Every structure is written in structure tokens, then in C-alpha cells.
Design a protein around this ligand. Structure first.
Ligand SMILES: Nc1nc2c(ncn2[C@@H]2O[C@H](COP(=O)(O)OP(=O)(O)NP(=O)(O)O)[C@@H](O)[C@H]2O)c(=O)[nH]1
Ligand SMILES: [Mg+2]
Length: 167
């Protein structure tokens, strides 16, 4: 196809859940076991092929530490999509993700597409958030949900592509 589309995506979530790793895996195909916490935000882009359409992603990888919370609107205000990420081995990170979802539903564009990533799924031997419970929560709140692993690549390209398909 010769059609070209571009859209803005923002990643939000508690510090250390794997936002930067998810983006690096999708954009550069890399995974770093020692990834430093993000300061403010980082920007990356990736272009993919989706049904006769070339889709370019402009990605804002936000720093998740609470001291950067007041900067979030600068990154999500014009976003067409968001991926709120939690760590499947940390229930508190899942609760934090729900609060990010609430903030997006109240303050971001009313037409924003929101995905929920249950990341670090490769650590299921330390699971703290039940898959079905998270799926039910996502279904009830109209969120595109997938468990992912930046470490193994499981569902990484899939969640980004699923979002592009629903834009
Ligand atoms: N086992 C595993 N470790 C992961 C996964 N994704 C990220 N990690 C690890 O988790 C740690 C934090 O990841 P990072 O991407 O920096 O998290 P973040 O959400 O960007 N943190 P911040 O918001 O502070 O910038 C790193 O040690 C990274 O290697 C995953 O899918 N599986
Ligand atoms: Mg980061």
C-alpha cells in the first residue's frame, strides 16, 4: 500500500515496570537488564507496515517516578494513544496503572485509545496480578490489554500493532 499514517503514543506507569524496555524492544529490538530510570521523558520513533498502510509511531516514554507526575499532561495531551504499563509481579504497580487510566479518561483527548500492558510476564513464577482479573478490568474500562515481556519480546510488537489497528 501507498498510504502513510502517523500518530502520537505515550507510555505511562509506575517507575521500574518496564516502559523504557518495552519501547526499546519495539523500536530497536533491544533489551537491557540494567536500564537506568528515565529522567523526565525520552522520545523514540518506529515505522511499521500495517494493512497496505505505513504507520509511523511518535513515542513518548515518560519517567514514572512520582516527582515527574506534574509533567505527564505535556506528554499525553496530544496523544492519540497511550500504553499504561504495570508489572505483573507487583500489585501496587497495577493499582497505580488504574489511577493513570482514570487520569487519562478524565484529562486526555476523549478519543484516545488506551492499552494496558501487564509487563514482565516472563516472571509469572512471581505473579501478583491475576491475568483474568486484569482482563476483566480492561474489558470493563474499554482498554486494549495484553501481558508482555520486553525481556523475551512476547507480545511487544503485538500490542503496538493492535493499537495502530484501532486508530
Ligand atoms: N524480567 C523482566 N525484566 C524487565 C522487563 N521489562 C523491563 N525489565 C527490567 O525492569 C527494570 C526497569 O525497566 P525500565 O524499562 O527501566 O523501567 P521504566 O518503567 O522505564 N522505569 P522509569 O519509569 O523509572 O523510567 C530493568 O532492570 C529492566 O531490565 C520484562 O519484561 N521482564
Ligand atoms: Mg524508563
Amino acid at each position: 500500500g501507498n498510504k502513510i499514517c502517523q500518530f502520537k503514543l505515550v507510555l505511562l506507569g509506575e517507575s521500574r515496570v518496564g516502559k523504557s524496555s518495552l519501547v526499546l524492544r519495539f523500536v530497536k529490538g533491544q533489551f537491557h537488564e540494567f536500564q537506568e530510570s528515565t529522567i523526565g521523558a525520552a522520545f523514540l520513533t518506529q515505522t511499521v507496515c500495517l494493512d497496505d498502510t505505513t504507520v509511523k509511531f511518535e513515542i513518548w516514554d515518560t519517567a514514572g517516578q512520582e516527582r515527574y507526575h506534574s509533567l505527564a499532561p505535556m506528554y499525553y495531551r496530544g496523544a492519540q494513544a497511550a500504553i499504561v504499563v504495570y508489572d505483573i509481579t507487583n500489585e501496587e504497580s497495577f493499582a497505580r496503572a488504574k489511577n493513570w487510566v482514570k487520569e487519562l479518561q478524565r484529562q486526555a483527548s476523549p478519543n484516545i485509545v488506551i492499552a494496558l500492558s501487564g509487563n514482565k510476564a516472563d516472571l509469572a513464577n512471581k505473579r501478583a496480578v491475576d491475568f483474568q482479573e486484569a482482563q476483566s478490568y480492561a474489558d470493563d474500562n474499554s482498554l486494549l490489554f495484553m501481558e508482555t515481556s520486553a525481556k523475551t519480546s512476547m507480545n511487544v510488537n503485538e500490542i503496538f500493532m493492535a493499537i495502530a489497528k484501532k486508530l
